[PDB]
Backbone:
């Protein structure tokens, strides 16, 4: 380079800052001192060096003197969006009111008190505006270390969430107030009318969140339609964030920080649209960007302070700094204590230890430093330039040195860092198991031949994995049993979640319920009286909004097809969606003319504008008249039948009247009378009402979103209930193994069964209330399960080596794309008609001849409340298929009681074995049934005798139904999930007893064999066995004989 | 690819039967049988000598599977796996010669001389 | 901002370039 | 992970800048050699860190390409198309064939 060539020197400064940050982080990993203090010290040293050596000055001149606008616009959005993204949105929303009240009111009061203190105590003659700016700067916090400690010690997750949310809202509101008062101070603007100020406040405080919400909705919608593109998604996120901030702050002046906060929160909430790996990458990406910004700001502030602020300072400034530190520390605690009653009697409340921890955790961060730098650059006077930066940096340093270092000791003193004994025991057990496994592997390695010379010193270097942490009877027995139930429920929920069925919110709800039950004394988890109601409830004016939307939408069911003229063509054109599209296009086109006319009225260019506006208005009026002619004609009176069309007719009439009046205004009519001649607004403002004609399309779409939300709510509730049900079953078997003390097993089982039955009935009724959303939920679950199993099969095939990486990646990409497309599916589905329900029954599904034999046969029966479909002991004479409704079965089989719903059969066993009814079934709601006679069933079975015979399929269904409980009971803590047992039993088959005396060898491949309904004997003992029962491995050999009374039916696996 | 797609279809059918047998999921629309991600297969669409060629190819495939399994378990590394696969493919390309002659093709790496 | 206030206008250009690139990539995925 | 990523970025940019400006030397070749060497001995980096780094650098390159392509069109339309004759297109065709 030569002459005037500017080699960018900022690159060296930024790279050096990154290098110094890395060195500081690496060196002080163990020392309690935060590395930010080291960064500040290094920056100060660099500034002092540069103040003397001219060469270093050039490399620290354009970065230590940035224009404040660049600093803000480049750094603030990154920090704010990262903070919003990192937080856990759901827990934050669960206690939104507490955080909002705390943040807002505490910040306001603290800023006011700090401003008054600065005005009075300090000798600087400051007016109220400067003091308020000072307080706003000093009232911003940044609790990263405290949150990290609270998370790692695993105590009071809600406390960490509260702290994070309060910090976020505090930063946003502090930036808003600082902007307001900075504009007030450095850019005086005449007087301040009440109306102007009210409008300014309304804008800055409302338009921000609205703009952010709109941007977030649009960006989420676009993101949901991207498949197989990570770069596009990341770039979209970055561009959306920066454009939101920039446009909101500069054009259409609005609070940019609030908009970015809302956008980040919304994107965090609806993060299911993004692909998994993309979000995993995004987390680290934003974390790194925030780290870079923090490092740069901390390095810059030290240089700037050492070069400017330390020049102007007196002996009293340090005294004022000490006093200010004390005062702010006192003020934070005073505010928290004062607001304790309101947020404690309501919301979640606080404990004194939590209040102390919150008070001591108020560490100032980088936002205050950035604002101080802005203020310093905005002035050339010491009275506000040096003092602001000096005091801000001093407070930051004092907080970092003292509070950050002593937070751990304060936590220890309060006794909030103790380790629960069960956790210690679990860790010890895990370490012992790891040691045993390592010893076994070491023995196996030693036995080898190619590895015998290897040094065995590695026993010490084998990564021992030293365990961390260093270091009347009825009541206690009941407590132990309750804790055991808690643990069993937790394990069952966690296994279901890991398998991918328990979701996340449901798992958190279940774990919280279990922990709360454990905390309480003598009360089983999941009372179910109300704790399992609201989620299933899903009741709020959202349902009222849905009903109002449904009622508003009204139209003629049908219209006659006149034979005059063309006829069908005109009706099709009028009713075709093309007509609606044209109407919408015309409305959109006319909207621009209305806005143009309004702007012109409010404000040869004029002649051209008037001619264009008149031509557009005439064209729009002609189009509206043509559209009206399309209707009315043929429809006749039907055109006026719908009250909605009345608004369109009125709009067209008004537009035509205005156009006619404006065209000539010479024929007569009003003329001299007050009209558009003197005030033409009435001839144009009413044109805006044409836009309202589009509201007809808005009503349906709105319903959609509402349905969506409803679905989600219901969806979640549904899932949670199912979880509990399944969990209970598992615990059931577990409850049999332990305890061993009678009169307690009843204590647990009574509650378990009562809760299970109540939840089952609630779910059945809730589904019956909303027949639509249930179908969608079930379909989504089925698709998810099928896709998961297909992906597992693909992984197994790839691992076996039969598939190359190219094909495996292709199949995985296809599966991922299909899953993502599934994530965006219609909220509600129309329930299938009964005929397809009958055609989809598993056992008769297949050959179409059987479906014909059934559909041509059968009958439909209607029942009402309290109708007894079947009487206990009544001879089995037919089946039943629940095509709609819900029934309750009661009887002795332990007086078992259960509920059944749509898509279930009833009397299979009676037909297959000709036995009296099992339990009496009574309708709990108007029900519809399919009743297939026993005689017709026997005729069908006799007619069809192919290899997959109908009788064989029915017996297979019955056997698989019976077998599951026994295999589940076999699980004595081994772990089977009650679902993998279903898959294991699926591969089984019935006994093909061609000869009565088969001797099926009991090899290790067959695993287990069950006795469904029959008599089997051992090879040696030939012990008599009566079904149902599991043969068990004790009977080594399984011979057989031809029984007479009961035909022997056995289920076997291999 | 055809074999893999057929196996995936069989697994999907078994899972569909298991789901249908369930009780809490009977009303769910079974149109999914079409929307269940069929995973349509891509690509659309003297005896002694031949027997020996088939046996050589079978040996090639067996060696490839063994190397792939060992690498997946985390023992065969990557460069070694690439060397073995290249040797197998070159042997396959040539006619009537077993993979890994070992005469010189397995010497330089053990050599380490320079 | 007032007087001589330089609001960085590079941000708008860079963000618009990213948006246009994303749109172009998404639209012409199938076209050669 | 943040330290590793920052170290990579700073090393790359410092290498190029220092090599090109101070002690005049071919910066591009130095960066090429540094990238190749780091790629070869990538076992030092942790697995997840390298997985992240691949996508990070890919995205950065994509951003640079997009910016350059967008800028070139504006610059050409504003400056180059002003000066052009009927023979320039003929020369363009001939040059394409020749290369
Ligand atoms: C540390 C990261 C890896 C290594 C460095 C990566 C690349 C660094 C450059 C990034 C783009 C900025 C180039 C500098 C601007 C050109 C003009 C100039 O410097 O002349 C002074 C320039 C020219 O105008 P004048 O001096 O007013 O005449 O001064 C200004 O007015 C603007 C101030 C420019 C410096 C602003 C601070 C840096 C902004 C970006 C934040 C840091 C990078 C974030 C992370 C990026 C990677 C992920
Ligand atoms: C006045 C302030 C409010 C003005 C209107 C805000 C615009 C609407 C914001 C989103 C509300 C609806 C979200 C959807 C929902 O309810 O479910 C949550 C929804 C998730 O829905 P899910 O999919 O069912 O989980 O997303 C959220 O979590 C939204 C929460 C973020 C927005 C509210 C919090 C931030 C408010 C702005 C800061 C406080 C105001 C400061 C004003 C004074 C400053 C000096
Ligand atoms: C698209 C990515 C997300 C959205 C944007 C991210 C942040 C964008 C800003 C990055 C830092 C540069 C700030 C602008 C420099 C300040 C001074 C200025 O603009 O005035 C003109 C500035 C002031 O000097 P004067 O105009 O000569 O008086 O003009 C110059 O001489 C320097 C030219 C500055 C623009 C250079 C091009 C941009 C460099 C960075 C490459 C793009 C970002 C790479 C990806 C980053 C995220 C990973």
Residues:
């Amino acid at each position: 380079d030569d002459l005037h060539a500017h080699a960018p020197k900022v690159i060296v400064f930024i790279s050096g800052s990154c290098l110094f940050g890395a060195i500081s982080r690496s060196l002080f990993k163990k020392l309690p001192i935060p590395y930010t203090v080291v960064l500040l010290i290094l920056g100060a040293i660099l500034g002092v060096v540069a103040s003397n050596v001219p060469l270093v000055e050039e490399h620290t001149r354009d970065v230590a003197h940035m224009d404040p606008h660049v600093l803000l616009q480049i750094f603030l959005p990154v920090l704010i969006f990262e903070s919003a993204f990192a937080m856990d949105v759901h827990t934050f929303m669960r206690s939104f009111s507490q955080v909002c009240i705390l943040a807002l009111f505490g910040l306001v009061v603290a800023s006011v008190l700090t401003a008054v203190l600065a005005m009075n105590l300090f000798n600087y003659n400051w007016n109220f505006s400067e003091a308020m700016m000072f307080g706003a700067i000093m009232s911003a916090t940044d609790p990263v270390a405290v949150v990290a400690l609270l998370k790692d010690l695993g105590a009071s997750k809600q406390l960490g969430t509260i702290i994070e949310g309060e910090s976020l809202l505090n930063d946003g509101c502090a930036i808003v107030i600082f902007n307001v008062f900075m504009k007030m101070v450095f850019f005086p603007q005449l007087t301040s009318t009440v109306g102007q100020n009210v409008l300014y406040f309304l804008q800055v405080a409302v338009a921000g969140p609205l703009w952010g919400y709109a941007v977030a909705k649009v960006t989420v919608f676009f993101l949901s339609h991207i498949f197989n593109d990570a770069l596009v998604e990341i770039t979209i996120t970055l561009a959306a964030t920066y454009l939101t901030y920039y446009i909101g702050d500069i054009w259409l002046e609005v609070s940019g920080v609030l908009a970015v906060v809302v956008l980040g929160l919304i994107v965090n909430a609806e993060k299911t649209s993004i692909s998994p790996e993309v979000e995993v990458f995004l987390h680290r990406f934003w974390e790194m960007l925030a780290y870079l910004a923090n490092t740069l700001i901390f390095m810059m502030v030290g240089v700037v302070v050492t070069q400017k602020a330390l020049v102007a300072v007196d002996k009293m400034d340090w005294f004022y700094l000490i006093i200010l530190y004390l005062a702010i520390t006192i003020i934070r605690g005073m505010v928290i204590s004062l607001f304790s009653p309101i947020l404690s009697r309501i919301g979640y409340g606080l404990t004194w230890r939590n209040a102390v921890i919150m008070t001591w955790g108020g560490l100032r961060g980088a936002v205050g430093l950035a604002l101080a730098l802005v203020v310093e650059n905005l002035a050339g006077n010491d009275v506000i330039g040096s003092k602001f930066l000096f005091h801000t940096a001093g407070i930051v340093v004092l907080t970092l040195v003292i509070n950050a270092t002593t937070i751990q000791t304060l936590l220890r003193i309060l006794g909030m860092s103790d380790i629960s004994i069960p956790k210690r025991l679990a860790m010890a057990g895990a370490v012992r198991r790891i040691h045993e496994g390592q010893n076994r592997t070491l023995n196996m390695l030693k036995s080898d031949r190619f590895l015998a010379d290897a040094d065995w010193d590695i026993a010490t270097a084998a990564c021992e994995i030293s365990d961390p942490y260093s270091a009347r009877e009825f009541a206690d027995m009941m407590e132990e049993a309750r804790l055991r139930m808690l643990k069993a429920e937790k394990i069952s929920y966690w296994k279901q979640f890991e398998h991918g069925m328990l979701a996340r919110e449901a798992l958190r709800l279940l774990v919280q319920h279990a922990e709360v039950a454990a905390d309480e004394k003598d009360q089983f988890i999941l009372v179910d009286d109300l704790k399992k109601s609201w989620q299933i409830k899903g009741i709020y004016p959202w349902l009222k909004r849905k009903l109002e939307d449904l009622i508003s939408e009204k139209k003629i069911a049908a219209i006659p097809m006149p034979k005059y003229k063309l006829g069908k063509l005109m009706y099709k054109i009028c009713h075709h969606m093309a007509f609606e599209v044209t109407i919408n296009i015309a409305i959109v086109l006319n909207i621009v003319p209305i806005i143009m006319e309004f702007v012109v009225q409010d404000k040869s260019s004029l002649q051209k504008i008037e001619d264009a506006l008149r031509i557009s208005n005439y064209v729009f009026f002609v189009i509206y008249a043509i559209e009206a002619i399309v209707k009315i004609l043929g429809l006749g009176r039907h055109y006026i039948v719908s009250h909605w069309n009345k608004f369109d007719a009125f709009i067209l009439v008004v537009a035509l009247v205005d156009i006619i009046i404006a065209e000539t205004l010479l024929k007569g009519s009003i003329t001299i009378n007050l009209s558009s001649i003197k005030v033409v607004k009435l001839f144009r403002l009413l044109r805006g009402l044409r836009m309202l004609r589009l509201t007809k399309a808005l009503i349906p779409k709105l319903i959609l979103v509402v349905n969506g939300k409803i679905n989600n709510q219901l969806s979640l509730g549904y899932d949670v209930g199912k979880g509990y049900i399944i969990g209970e079953e598992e615990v059931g078997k577990i409850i049999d193994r332990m305890v061993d003390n009678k009169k307690i097993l009843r204590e647990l089982k009574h509650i378990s069964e009562t809760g299970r039955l109540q939840v089952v009935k609630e779910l059945g009724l809730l589904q019956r209330e909303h027949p639509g959303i249930a179908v969608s939920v079930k379909t989504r679950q089925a698709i998810r399960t099928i896709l998961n199993h297909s992906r597992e099969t693909i992984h197994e095939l790839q691992g076996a080596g039969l598939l190359d990486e190219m094909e495996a990646h292709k199949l995985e990409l296809t599966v991922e794309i299909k899953m993502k497309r599934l994530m965006n599916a219609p909220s509600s589905i129309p329930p299938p008609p009964p005929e397809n329900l009958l055609k989809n029954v598993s056992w008769l599904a297949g050959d179409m001849k059987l479906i014909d034999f059934i559909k041509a046969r059968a009958s439909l029966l209607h029942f009402d409340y309290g109708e007894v479909i079947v009487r206990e002991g009544d001879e089995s004479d037919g089946l039943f298929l629940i095509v709609s409704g819900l029934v309750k079965l009661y009887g002795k089989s332990e007086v078992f009681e259960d509920y059944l719903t749509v898509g279930n059969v009833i009397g299979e066993m009676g037909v297959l074995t000709k036995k009296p009814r099992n339990a009496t079934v009574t309708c709990e709601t108007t029900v519809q049934v399919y009743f297939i006679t026993a005689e017709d069933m026997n005729i069908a079975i006799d007619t069809f005798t192919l290899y997959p015979s109908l009788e064989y399929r029915l017996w297979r269904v019955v056997a698989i139904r019976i077998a599951t409980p026994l295999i589940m009971e076999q699980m004595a803590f081994q772990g089977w999930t009650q679902e993998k047992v279903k898959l294991h039993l699926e591969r089984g088959y019935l006994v093909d007893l061609a000869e009565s005396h088969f001797q099926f060898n009991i090899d290790a491949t067959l695993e287990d064999v069950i006795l469904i309904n029959g008599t089997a004997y051992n090879a040696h003992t030939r012990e008599e066995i009566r079904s149902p029962c599991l043969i068990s491995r004790t009977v080594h050999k399984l011979t057989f004989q031809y029984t007479a009374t009961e035909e022997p039916r056995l289920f076997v696996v291999r």
